Design an enzyme around this catalytic site. Sequence first.
Site, PDB file in Angstrom:
ATOM      1  N   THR A 215       5.944   0.513  14.682  1.00 10.46           N
ATOM      2  CA  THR A 215       7.321   0.887  14.976  1.00 10.46           C
ATOM      3  C   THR A 215       8.103  -0.367  15.381  1.00 10.46           C
ATOM      4  O   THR A 215       7.738  -1.069  16.339  1.00 10.46           O
ATOM      5  CB  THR A 215       7.402   1.906  16.111  1.00 10.46           C
TER       6      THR A 215
ATOM      7  N   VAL B  10      -6.104 -15.863  17.052  1.00 14.01           N
ATOM      8  CA  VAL B  10      -6.138 -16.301  18.443  1.00 14.01           C
ATOM      9  C   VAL B  10      -7.490 -15.965  19.080  1.00 14.01           C
ATOM     10  O   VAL B  10      -8.004 -16.756  19.903  1.00 14.01           O
ATOM     11  CB  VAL B  10      -4.974 -15.648  19.234  1.00 14.01           C
TER      12      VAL B  10
ATOM     13  N   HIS C 128       7.213 -18.778   8.947  1.00 14.77           N
ATOM     14  CA  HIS C 128       6.506 -20.043   8.747  1.00 14.77           C
ATOM     15  C   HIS C 128       7.122 -20.846   7.621  1.00 14.77           C
ATOM     16  O   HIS C 128       7.220 -22.069   7.729  1.00 14.77           O
ATOM     17  CB  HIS C 128       5.016 -19.807   8.535  1.00 14.77           C
TER      18      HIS C 128
ATOM     19  N   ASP D  92      12.107 -22.220   1.103  1.00 11.35           N
ATOM     20  CA  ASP D  92      11.939 -22.746  -0.233  1.00 11.35           C
ATOM     21  C   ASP D  92      10.646 -22.278  -0.899  1.00 11.35           C
ATOM     22  O   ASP D  92      10.399 -22.593  -2.059  1.00 11.35           O
ATOM     23  CB  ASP D  92      12.016 -24.263  -0.208  1.00 11.35           C
TER      24      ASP D  92
ATOM     25  N   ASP E 262      10.513  -1.165  17.381  1.00  8.65           N
ATOM     26  CA  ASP E 262      11.195  -0.725  18.599  1.00  8.65           C
ATOM     27  C   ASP E 262      11.184  -1.880  19.613  1.00  8.65           C
ATOM     28  O   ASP E 262      10.772  -3.001  19.315  1.00  8.65           O
ATOM     29  CB  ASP E 262      10.464   0.509  19.116  1.00  8.65           C
TER      30      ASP E 262
ATOM     31  N   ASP F  49       0.819  -1.211   0.000  1.00 10.24           N
ATOM     32  CA  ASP F  49       0.000   0.000   0.000  1.00 10.24           C
ATOM     33  C   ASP F  49       0.852   1.260   0.000  1.00 10.24           C
ATOM     34  O   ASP F  49       0.562   2.217   0.735  1.00 10.24           O
ATOM     35  CB  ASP F  49      -0.957  -0.003   1.184  1.00 10.24           C
TER      36      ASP F  49
HETATM   37  C1  HEM Z   1       7.711 -19.344  19.515  1.00  9.95           C
HETATM   38  C2  HEM Z   1       7.683 -18.784  18.324  1.00  9.95           C
HETATM   39  C3  HEM Z   1       6.478 -18.108  17.864  1.00  9.95           C
HETATM   40  C4  HEM Z   1       5.155 -18.272  18.181  1.00  9.95           C
HETATM   41  C5  HEM Z   1       4.521 -19.344  19.082  1.00  9.95           C
HETATM   42  C6  HEM Z   1       4.456 -17.264  17.514  1.00  9.95           C
HETATM   43  C7  HEM Z   1       3.057 -17.104  17.536  1.00  9.95           C
HETATM   44  C8  HEM Z   1       2.367 -16.108  16.888  1.00  9.95           C
HETATM   45  C9  HEM Z   1       0.959 -15.943  16.860  1.00  9.95           C
HETATM   46  C10 HEM Z   1       0.022 -16.913  17.556  1.00  9.95           C
HETATM   47  C11 HEM Z   1       0.619 -14.869  16.108  1.00  9.95           C
HETATM   48  C12 HEM Z   1      -0.799 -14.345  15.806  1.00  9.95           C
HETATM   49  C13 HEM Z   1      -1.346 -15.027  14.550  1.00  9.95           C
HETATM   50  C14 HEM Z   1      -2.769 -14.610  14.266  1.00  9.95           C
HETATM   51  O1  HEM Z   1      -3.606 -14.795  15.177  1.00  9.95           O
HETATM   52  O2  HEM Z   1      -3.068 -14.041  13.224  1.00  9.95           O
HETATM   53  C15 HEM Z   1       1.892 -14.332  15.618  1.00  9.95           C
HETATM   54  C16 HEM Z   1       2.012 -13.183  14.818  1.00  9.95           C
HETATM   55  C17 HEM Z   1       3.213 -12.803  14.178  1.00  9.95           C
HETATM   56  N1  HEM Z   1       4.396 -13.450  14.301  1.00  9.95           N
HETATM   57 FE1  HEM Z   1       4.901 -14.800  15.626  1.00  9.95          FE
HETATM   58  N2  HEM Z   1       5.315 -16.523  16.770  1.00  9.95           N
HETATM   59  C18 HEM Z   1       6.557 -16.978  16.950  1.00  9.95           C
HETATM   60  C19 HEM Z   1       7.715 -16.521  16.341  1.00  9.95           C
HETATM   61  C20 HEM Z   1       7.860 -15.598  15.299  1.00  9.95           C
HETATM   62  C21 HEM Z   1       9.010 -15.354  14.497  1.00  9.95           C
HETATM   63  C22 HEM Z   1      10.315 -16.103  14.644  1.00  9.95           C
HETATM   64  C23 HEM Z   1       8.655 -14.365  13.581  1.00  9.95           C
HETATM   65  C24 HEM Z   1       9.468 -13.699  12.543  1.00  9.95           C
HETATM   66  C25 HEM Z   1      10.766 -13.616  12.654  1.00  9.95           C
HETATM   67  C26 HEM Z   1       7.273 -14.055  13.843  1.00  9.95           C
HETATM   68  C27 HEM Z   1       6.569 -13.039  13.273  1.00  9.95           C
HETATM   69  C28 HEM Z   1       5.221 -12.743  13.545  1.00  9.95           C
HETATM   70  C29 HEM Z   1       4.572 -11.612  12.958  1.00  9.95           C
HETATM   71  C30 HEM Z   1       5.196 -10.593  12.070  1.00  9.95           C
HETATM   72  C31 HEM Z   1       3.285 -11.639  13.313  1.00  9.95           C
HETATM   73  C32 HEM Z   1       2.202 -10.666  13.004  1.00  9.95           C
HETATM   74  C33 HEM Z   1       1.306 -10.962  11.866  1.00  9.95           C
HETATM   75  C34 HEM Z   1       0.340  -9.848  11.550  1.00  9.95           C
HETATM   76  O3  HEM Z   1       0.333  -8.797  12.199  1.00  9.95           O
HETATM   77  O4  HEM Z   1      -0.389 -10.049  10.525  1.00  9.95           O
HETATM   78  N3  HEM Z   1       6.847 -14.837  14.891  1.00  9.95           N
HETATM   79  N4  HEM Z   1       2.944 -15.128  16.090  1.00  9.95           N
HETATM   80 CA   LIG Z   2       6.534  -1.909  18.355  1.00  9.05          CA
HETATM   81 CA   LIG Z   3       9.199 -24.031   3.522  1.00  6.91          CA
HETATM   82 MG   LIG Z   4      -3.575  -3.182   2.674  1.00  6.60          MG
END
Ligand code: HEM
Ligand SMILES: [Ca+2]
Ligand SMILES: [Ca+2]
Ligand SMILES: [Mg+2]
Length: 331
Positions: free
Chosen positions: A193, A178, A47, A63, A195, A30
């Site tokens: 941000t 969730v 993922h 991949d 941060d 956007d």
């Molecule tokens: C123990 C490891 C992790 C768990 C259990 C976890 C779990 C979650 C959960 C449950 C959500 C919400 C999903 C939804 O309801 O839509 C989420 C969002 C997110 N996770 Fe994690 N996560 C983990 C690690 C990571 C890692 C390693 C990254 C990237 C380096 C990541 C990036 C994100 C991002 C960017 C979102 C936001 C998505 C959005 O705003 O659309 N997560 N995670």
């Molecule tokens: Ca923040």
């Molecule tokens: Ca893969």
């Molecule tokens: Mg949009």
Amino acid sequence: VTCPDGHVTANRACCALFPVVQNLQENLFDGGECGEEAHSALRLSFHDAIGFSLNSNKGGGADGSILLFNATELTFHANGGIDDITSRQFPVFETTGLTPGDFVHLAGAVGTANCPGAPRLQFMFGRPPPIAPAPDLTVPEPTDDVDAILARFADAGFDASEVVALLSSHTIAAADVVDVTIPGTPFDSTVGTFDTQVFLEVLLAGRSFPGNGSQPGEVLSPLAGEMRLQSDFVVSRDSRTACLWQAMVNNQQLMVSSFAAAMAKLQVLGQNVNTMVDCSDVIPEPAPFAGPIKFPASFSMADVEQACASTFPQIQTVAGPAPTVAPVPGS
Ligand code: HEM
Ligand SMILES: [Ca+2]
Ligand SMILES: [Ca+2]
Ligand SMILES: [Mg+2]
Ligand SMILES: [Mg+2]
Ligand SMILES: [Mg+2]
Ligand SMILES: [Mn+2]
């Protein structure tokens, strides 16, 4: 090299990517925003990549399997919410000519760059098409305990330091699935941000649920409109990770440097880096974020549940009513 596009680059092989990045910025993000699609792209990158093991065959890593084998991988419980992400990415991907893996990982790096404070991530280029879907259970669940989290990450090649580094991502993250009654509920009060606010806010005493009460995967949160994952709560407080977590609090450079290094590994899991080309110059330069974080209004050290013996960082308190965190706009 001057690309026919006009852009200058170190390697001719990067020339294709300058138009793709423009396509992403216009048609996925956007106009280069730190919004839903940017946050989603980072989540998808994780993922996709974590479908990998150093030991056994748990997939080809970074991949693009999660796109090519979308139908299979979207059946796995830990990929809840991913369907909305890939649905939105596909129309853009389809005009790029890229392998699914190069597209997923580029979009994740570009999206991250749209968030003030973020690192400019390394972008290696050259991910062959995926051969097979990841099996189930490669992705951690928010109901996982620290033992399970640390085991899964270690299996893929990441130690505790790197796990905390990678959870920095939750500084620009919201939940849609969730609690489906409150889509777009952020994990910190600065979801636009990159941060260290999330590291502080997870350490606050939790007091309420943000939506339809208690839902599996969350625990009590400190702010109206903010969600706290059970996984972030336990990682912040466990003896193996607590000092690592606390060290991030109000330490912008430690967060960004740690994250940058861990992401460079994550985004090439399963790949032969010697056969890839460095195309880091196609990633937009992020806006800076220096100044310190602050407590949300009304909170103080009294509300911090300190889990590490190191002196807690000094952080300014703000007089006023506790704030309500707004949801992230759907697109
Ligand atoms: C123990 C490891 C992790 C768990 C259990 C976890 C779990 C979650 C959960 C449950 C959500 C919400 C999903 C939804 O309801 O839509 C989420 C969002 C997110 N996770 Fe994690 N996560 C983990 C690690 C990571 C890692 C390693 C990254 C990237 C380096 C990541 C990036 C994100 C991002 C960017 C979102 C936001 C998505 C959005 O705003 O659309 N997560 N995670
Ligand atoms: Ca923040
Ligand atoms: Ca893969
Ligand atoms: Mg949009
Ligand atoms: Mg510790
Ligand atoms: Mg400390
Ligand atoms: Mn989302």
